[PDB]
Amino acid sequence: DEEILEKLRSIVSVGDPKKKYTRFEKIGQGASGTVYTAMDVATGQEVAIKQMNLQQQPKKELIINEILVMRENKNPNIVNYLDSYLVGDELWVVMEYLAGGSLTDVVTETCMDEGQIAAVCRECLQALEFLHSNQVIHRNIKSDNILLGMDGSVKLTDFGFCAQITPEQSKRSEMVGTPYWMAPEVVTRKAYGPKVDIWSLGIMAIEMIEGEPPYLNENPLRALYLIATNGTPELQNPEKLSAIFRDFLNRCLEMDVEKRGSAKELLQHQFLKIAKPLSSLTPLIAAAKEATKNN
Numbered sequence: 467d468e469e470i471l472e473k474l475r476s477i478v479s480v481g482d483p484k485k486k487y488t489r490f491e492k493i494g495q496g497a498s499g500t501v502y503t504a505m506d507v508a509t510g511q512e513v514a515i516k517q518m519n520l521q522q523q524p525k526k527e528l529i530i531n532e533i534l535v536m537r538e539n540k541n542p543n544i545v546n547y548l549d550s551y552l553v554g555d556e557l558w559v560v561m562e563y564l565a566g567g568s569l570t571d572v573v574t575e576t577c578m579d580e581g582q583i584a585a586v587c588r589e590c591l592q593a594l595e596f597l598h599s600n601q602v603i604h605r606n607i608k609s610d611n612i613l614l615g616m617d618g619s620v621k622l623t624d625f626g627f628c629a630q631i632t633p634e635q636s637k638r639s640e641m642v643g644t645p646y647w648m649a650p651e652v653v654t655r656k657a658y659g660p661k662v663d664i665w666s667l668g669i670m671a672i673e674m675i676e677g678e679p680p681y682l683n684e685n686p687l688r689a690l691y692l693i694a695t696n697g698t699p700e701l702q703n704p705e706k707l708s709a710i711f712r713d714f715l716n717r718c719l720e721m722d723v724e725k726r727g728s729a730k731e732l733l734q735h736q737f738l739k740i741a742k743p744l745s746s747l748t749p750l751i752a753a754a755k756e757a758t759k760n761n
């Protein structure tokens with residue numbers, strides 16, 4: 467529709483990004499747009515800006531929904547929205563910039579100890595508690611969507627797949643997310659809720675342990691089948707984990723949605739009590755950057 471486009475345009479101001487921001491440097495590109503780093507002229511704040519051609523963009527309703535969700539869900543454990551501009555047919559969206567890279571770089575190139583894993587899980591559960599208390603389900607938790615500051619701060623990004631629920635409609639039933647990280651009830655199209663994010667967090671903790679989510683060697687379709695049929699995945703070497711870490715994982719990856727922990731109750735779990743300070747993550751960030759120099 468041209469109606470859905472006009473609705474998208476209406477929630478964005480018309481203006482020039484260069485009035486407030488400079489030193490644009492392209493760090494990425496794709497169909498969904500070009501991504502730059504840039505700087506706030508008045509404050510010196512480094513920012514991340516996405517340039518997007520609106521005409522060609524499919525499923526504009528998801529762009530409307532992401533912008534709306536960010537504007538009303540600002541939090542220290544989220545990669546926050548700063549501003550947006552319309553210029554001609556292109557949309558510019560300004561976000562905080564995190565210079566420490568993604569958690570994916572860390573889990574694929576380093577060995578995290580349990581204190582560092584507990585820290586990351588805590589910060590993520592803080593974001594999830596905030597989101598769920600505002601009836602937002604992320605539905606795409608994975609290390610790729612966890613970004614790190616150079617001080618070890620931990621923030622969640624990418625709200626392109628999130629669902630807003632209501633007491634009227636408090637559950638969803640559609641297969642949305644990234645296969646390896648999807649909870650069984652999502653994969654098999656049952657009525658589901660916020661605890662699907664708790665499952666995906668459990669899979670991300672398996673990333674921090676083993677380097678990959680379960681079945682990454684398989685194609686996405688085979689992985690969906692395996693999740694549906696196996697339920698709670700198995701660790702290669704559970705012997706290597708503490709009793710309290712194993713219990714934390716079990717409570718994230720519980721098949722029974724009523725038995726699975728909420729974000730609020732996992733924030734009280736004993737595993738998080740051994741978390742190291744976030745400064746402990748900066749050597750991992752340094753390692754990850756070194757590892758990925760050649761790409």
Ligand SMILES: CCNc1ncc2cc(-c3ccc(-c4cncc(C)n4)cc3Cl)c(=O)n(C[C@H]3CC[C@H](N)CC3)c2n1
Nearest residue numbers: 501514515516532533559561562563564567568610611623
């Ligand atoms: C790793 C470098 N550090 C970093 N720090 C911050 C960001 C912020 C964004 C971003 C997020 C959301 C929006 C958005 C929101 N609402 C509507 C619309 C239309 N857009 C736009 C932007 Cl620019 C972004 O894409 N990346 C790039 C990374 C994203 C995560 C990915 N896995 C790696 C690249 C970022 N990278």
